[PDB]
Swiss-Prot record, chains D, E, F, H, J:
This is Catabolic 3-dehydroquinase. The lineage of its organism: Eukaryota, Fungi, Dikarya, Ascomycota, Saccharomycotina. It holds the Pfam family DHquinase_II. Belongs to the type-II 3-dehydroquinase family. It is an enzyme of class 4 (lyase). Its EC number is 4.2.1.10. Is involved in the catabolism of quinate. Allows the utilization of quinate as carbon source via the beta-ketoadipate pathway. Pathway: Aromatic compound metabolism; 3,4-dihydroxybenzoate biosynthesis; 3,4-dihydroxybenzoate from 3-dehydroquinate: step 1/2. It catalyses: 3-dehydroquinate = 3-dehydroshikimate + H2O. Keywords: Lyase, Quinate metabolism. GO terms for biological process: 3,4-dihydroxybenzoate biosynthetic process; quinate catabolic process. Signal peptide: none annotated.
UniProtKB/Swiss-Prot annotation, chain L:
This is Catabolic 3-dehydroquinase. GO terms for biological process: 3,4-dihydroxybenzoate biosynthetic process; quinate catabolic process. Belongs to the type-II 3-dehydroquinase family. CDD domains: DHQase_II (cd00466). Coiled coil: none annotated. InterPro entries: DHquinase_II, DHquinase_II_CS, DHquinase_II_sf. Homododecamer. Adopts a ring-like structure, composed of an arrangement of two hexameric rings stacked on top of one another. One of its GO terms (molecular function) is 3-dehydroquinate dehydratase activity. Keywords: Lyase, Quinate metabolism. Is involved in the catabolism of quinate. Allows the utilization of quinate as carbon source via the beta-ketoadipate pathway. NCBIfam families: aroQ, PRK05395.1-1, PRK05395.1-2, PRK05395.1-3, PRK05395.1-4. HAMAP family: AroQ. Its EC number is 4.2.1.10.
Length: 144, 144, 144, 143, 143, 143, 144, 143, 145, 143, 145, 147
């Protein structure tokens, strides 16, 4: 049963929500950190965001070294474009759930393809920032 | 916020799990009925399952006629095939979440297309039975 | 010269117009009946609606045994998914007209496919409810 | 309530029915001029036919200078090839109905694409010549 | 060795042959029943036909409840559109054979797609009604 | 047998050969006129070229009034784009042969599609200017 | 009035059955077929052919026509997906035919789903194992 | 470097902008004329507009004949349908720039394919009416 | 100078015309071609070949190079649509060629629209019936070497 | 009107033209800086180039923080592959024009897809370096 | 233990290298490979085959199995793009194989980018010139049974 | 002949040894690099192989530029994932005009269709794929012998 979970957010996700509710990246991350703290059995949620593909891959490599046992990832645009992230998650063999805040199926068809869905444990989309909470409950419940 | 959610499971879903955890349709429906009751506050989850497309359309008209304010739906095979169910939801104007117990993106490509996906609030898939639970949390916090 | 005409409407048609002018399914049916009576030569239009594919197929079967000479059909969603309805029409050998109240060509690409059009005598589409009236005028003047 | 309708037929339509019942283009046009005549209230149906794409565009342009409120068009072959005719109807903002005498869905897959349908108010096909009468009734009743 | 075989006919099949021999669904149902009697070894063929998808699914479910060990199915139209029936067969885990009386490959390219073939044990198409007999012979020898 | 043949050339072909040998449109037209005249049996080849689709359809219509019994056509770009010409040949019911001077399959993918080839008696393409001669022999021998 | 002379043709690689799933050999299938016919008291016959070379199979079909063969039962193996020349020879000699496959090709790589025989075959039996041939010979020996 | 330039506008462009600001085709044609007059070095910009494919092909041919060195062209609908125009600019060998007032990639995906882009010297599009000015500056500066 | 030696190849099943739609046999065609050259009365020649086997037609094309053949007129029949190998034989010996189809292939099943020859042939005549061959031979006999 | 404009150039662009006319990236950057000074009203053009997708994303976020009013961007390869750059421009809501020095439609089919075009204000491609000058002129005139 | 008996197969047209782009011939490549095994000095052997006829290459694969060939290195030429029959022969006899192209097919017509061998091959080397064959044989000769 | 060869390995390749060993083997990236370096040493004519690996697209592009500056005359590259996604790498290789060979350790053609497209293959001198680590050695022989 998983104690170490890493939340990753991809490009542009630092900009929520400067433009549709004031919910920021900082919020999501915090709520995730606190989610685990509150199980009080040393679960931990580590957090990372970047706009660089390679850096997200670097972070995933790091995660394995770190004994991270699950990843909740919202790869933002990189979902549609990055085989590299897919190969990283496969490569280090860490199970993961793909999060999208909005319903991608509502948008441009290029967004309906993902390089993560078919290898994710699960894909949550359009559940809002709550979608990160649901993934993290799943994660903290998953057998090593 | 919503007070009346309706859970629909489509064809074959009565068969779980006769064949991969001995978790029944019956269990899912129950857990959900409970989920709302435990919210203390006049929330309620009605349940339906049919093998027949027409009858599921019928149930969706029925749901509007009785003020159902949100649907959580696993259409099973019908996700890939039922334009009629999409139009029943659209035509009654009830928001909905598509559930899939398993991760469809892992399966045959025909199962990658859904006629519900681009009109749903969200689509949760591969989160196991838990996915009904998170659809229901969301539903019960959705404003009318 | 055709006496017995059967108007069929498909799934969700029961629902006009509760959401765009207060023109109900019931109205269309009535108008269609009166059209045939108001012809004075013992013409007649029978009416049917269902949300179930199988039921529409059955109704087309009895329509043969009942000697119906022509069918005017708004199949609603089943236009795009029902090879059964198509085969029933071919199988009983009743000529038909496909009706769409609104212009399907304005809508999502999937709705441009029909399983009726290439077998229909005509396709009227976007002419509003008057679509029915023109189909029936045409029906009534077609040679048995 | 619309009063000035223009019936447009595209290429080859001049040749019905020289090859399935003696019904000429000239009949369809006459029936349509007379249909408005009978409405009894200062409706009018103007008629046009050409085999030239630019000419049909030219016509649609002048339709708007003339205050045509609605078009009923059978673009013939141009249904499947003419973005310009689509753009003319859009550019002058005249609502329209698309008519085909026979049921194109019965014919070659190339004829299943139209550059009109998705901008048309309605599309009637396979209703035979009655298709035109039906479009006009509709036209004469619109906003 | 399999003792209980279910024969399912889909939508419109009740209509053979009203219009291409004098062979009805009732006949095909009856051949099939006798065929298993004649074997002598308490084999059994149960029959079903329905126009409704959900009802054919409902039946496949019942079929497991009943110990049916093989299904010979001519899904008619539903071969091309019914993922629900596919999942019923997979979900009850009853091995099956897809029959078509006529040769689907000779027809509209949409009829070449099936939701059954890739999971069927065999597909027989165009062998006429005998198509059913072959499928039952095979059924009655499966382990 | 056919006596009256119409040679049509589509857009731009007025410009051979100004850029892969010196042969001009009026050379080709000359040769066709004489090919038929030199039969010595009151055969006749009429010639036409235009850059306007509409006018090429007009001409194919006149050709029917004229009793023209076969058409040899090189439609230039219109091959790839004009259902209207297709439908004029079909609508007047004149049989025709499609001629491209250069081998079109050697060129851009779009030029592989034609709206004439599936309705033509034949397609000669890449046989140089002589393609027009072979088409006219063939024409002049048809029923 | 029924067919007497029948040609069983098997294509490339089929000599190799079953040397890798159970010891039923090509010669087995060929002998069973010969004996199927003789067992009819009535002068039917099965001729047998196998070849790895396309041209030779096409030559054999020409020869079959010279010999007054009224029906071919063919398993073209790999050539089913690649030989227009074989399809054109059956069409060319106007001999009817049933296409056989021992295993269910629909189960396999999508390229194997397309045939140059199916749309001109009388029937396609595929996946009925070896009995596939037997049933094709019954049908054949009963044909117009 | 190039002295004589032909600005062509295709179907429907006569209508700008009667319907989205008051810049008329005529304003554009003028500015372009004036643009080349101001260079004072003897440049010149001829202008043409038509709704008929054939006529634009004719015009392109005459421009060759009168030593036009560059063509700035907004073909409207014809970009997406006219292989005939492509073949005219190719056949008279005159370099050319494709202009679109509005950003075409924002619209219906059919308007994404163009039978000019891939042979044009440049494609300017969505830069508004200035699209024409820059095409011409570029034109007037070209070997 | 001009091409003096021309090989006519016919592919599979074409031995069968017209046993099934006028009595014009494969042999009639080959004779006619042979006669066409002889009649230029100048030491031109048409050599004729037909097989049902892809390999053998590839072989024949190789031989043709050895023999100094300078042009091929080919009706590959069904191999038109399936045979990369014939295409590469013609490319690899670098003999120029004309594709001939007796009937109009564009009138038939969509798969017959594709050819592995058309984009490398000097020309493709198709639908001009048997005269297709005569025309390809006139062209070939006038081609510059 | 806009005062602060950002010139972004993507990967490989620092290599011009080290292989097709000596015009370096520096040259283009200065021209652009200069264009704005000479407007004499404190318009300002900022410049940035990177071969790293993440970093161009960083830059666009930074531009927003700096109150950049408009972006003129040649994303080089990243045009065809980077949903991230598009979402950064969408995310910060800075209007932009896409530049390509060469005419990309002349090149491989993949270079015909852009993840910028349908969201850009305009797309200039093939005017060579003047392309940047035009995009900047336009930019500095945007309200 | 390790593969002792390797079969080198070359498909249609390859017999014509290099008659048109450097003088290296089929025979050269064959000889080179025969010697490669000889030098290992451990009773390894390369057998060689070329044919333009598909069926004959299918037959050669069967014969190989009967002979106990344990690896095939094949440049099918054009048949790569068109022969399910060849593919099914290597699958059928279960001999592991490597697909060679002398030149880089990915640089050529798009049809040449599809192979019926690649997804079943151990590796595919292309554009590595005639060395391609040598690299394939080195690998073969180290492959465990 | 060529003297300076640059071996580039793309993202994830640094995990050779651990990464998906059923598919990629258990020889580390470091061993592949050392083997390459020594391959050139042994040609005994002052050939040299230089090595580079990054998870970052931009960094690989930077490196390819750096290589023209240092007179590298040939590239042997396993772009990893970037084979299927990086037009930018392709443009860097084309912009510096350095010849290259595309290496795949596994046979990509047995894998997901996405992996059958490459943005290097059609411009590479050769593509070697599925020869496992030997792949690298053979691309390096090829380079060291190239004009």
């Amino acid at each position: 049963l998983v104690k170490k979970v890493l939340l990753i957010n991809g490009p542009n996700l630092n900009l929520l929500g400067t433009r549709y509710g004031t919910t920021s990246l900082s919020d999501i991350e915090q709520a995730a950190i606190e989610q685990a703290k509150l199980k009080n059995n040393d679960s931990e949620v580590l957090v990372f965001q970047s706009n660089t593909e390679g850096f997200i891959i670097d972070r995933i490599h790091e995660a394995k070294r770190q004994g991270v046992g699950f990843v909740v990832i919202n790869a933002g645009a990189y979902t549609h474009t990055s085989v590299g992230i897919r190969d990283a998650l496969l490569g280090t063999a860490i199970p993961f759930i793909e999060v999208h805040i909005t319903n991608v199926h509502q948008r441009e068809p290029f967004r309906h393809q993902s390089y993560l869905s078919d290898k994710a444990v699960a894909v949550i989309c359009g559940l809002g920032v709550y979608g990160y909470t649901a993934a993290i409950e799943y994660a903290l419940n998953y057998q090593l």
